[PDB]
């Protein structure tokens, strides 16, 4: 399984951000709003294939979460679809990025602003977000935002859609990797 692939909790469906690790322990990152209140994660809607359990969740304010792999046989590819990932980096205005989600698939665009504040309402405010012109739709939450072989962010939320176009905000992945002492591979 890899970045952009669908993941199911007991509440709904999100997408896997990136596969990461610490020593010999494997995790996967995704959106915080997806890990918030979820315990177990499955690879299918049938819930017959287990992935792991939530080990960390930060939302609102930030928007990342980490899940510890409990499944010992499932492939844990260090890619996004077939796109190898070898490092992480900081977004920059004008940077050309690509997103992959379980609903819309892969879509590209550019970073249009940094350190954005997104108010999802009811006190759910996130800060330090990457603004882009990439579209995204329900189910895409937590999917990776990359640039070539570099990991950049995790899909959080936005407006519009892929048909008429839209704006999507992403959580810098560097901050999540640092909080958890994990790294891409």
């Amino acid at each position: 399984i890899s970045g952009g692939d669908a993941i199911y909790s007991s509440t709904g469906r999100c997408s896997l951000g990136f596969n990461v690790r610490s020593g010999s322990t494997y995790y996967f990152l995704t959106a915080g709003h997806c890990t918030d209140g979820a315990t177990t994660w499955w690879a299918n809607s049938a819930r017959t294939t287990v992935l792991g359990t939530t080990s960390g969740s930060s939302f609102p304010n930030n928007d990342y979460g980490i899940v510890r792999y409990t499944n010992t046989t499932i492939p844990k590819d260090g890619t996004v679809g077939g796109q190898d990932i070898t490092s992480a980096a900081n977004a920059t205005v004008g940077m050309a990025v690509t997103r992959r989600g379980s609903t819309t698939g892969t879509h590209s665009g550019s970073v249009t602003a940094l350190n954005a504040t997104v108010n999802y309402g009811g006190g759910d405010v996130v800060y330090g977000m990457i603004r882009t012109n990439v579209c995204a739709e329900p189910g895409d939450s937590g999917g990776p935002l990359y640039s070539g072989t570099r990991a950049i962010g995790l899909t959080s939320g936005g407006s519009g859609n892929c048909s008429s176009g839209g704006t999507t905000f992403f959580q810098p992945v560097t901050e999540a990797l640092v909080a958890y002492g994990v790294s891409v591979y």
Partner: protein, 51 residues
């Protein structure tokens, strides 16, 4: 589902579908409620889950 706090300029995008009266499956409640606003209140919930 109550859409009083709408509209909202942004929505997180997890998938938890609702079926609207326009037979369209909305991906989550924030999406559904923003559409209700945009329809000027003519759009209604038909049932929970996909259409």
């Amino acid at each position: 589902v109550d859409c009083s706090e709408y509209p909202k300029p942004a929505c997180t995008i997890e998938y938890r579908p609702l079926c609207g009266s326009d037979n369209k499956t909305y991906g989550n409640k924030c999406n559904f409620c923003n559409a209700v606003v945009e329809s000027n209140g003519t759009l209604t919930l038909s049932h929970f889950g996909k259409c």
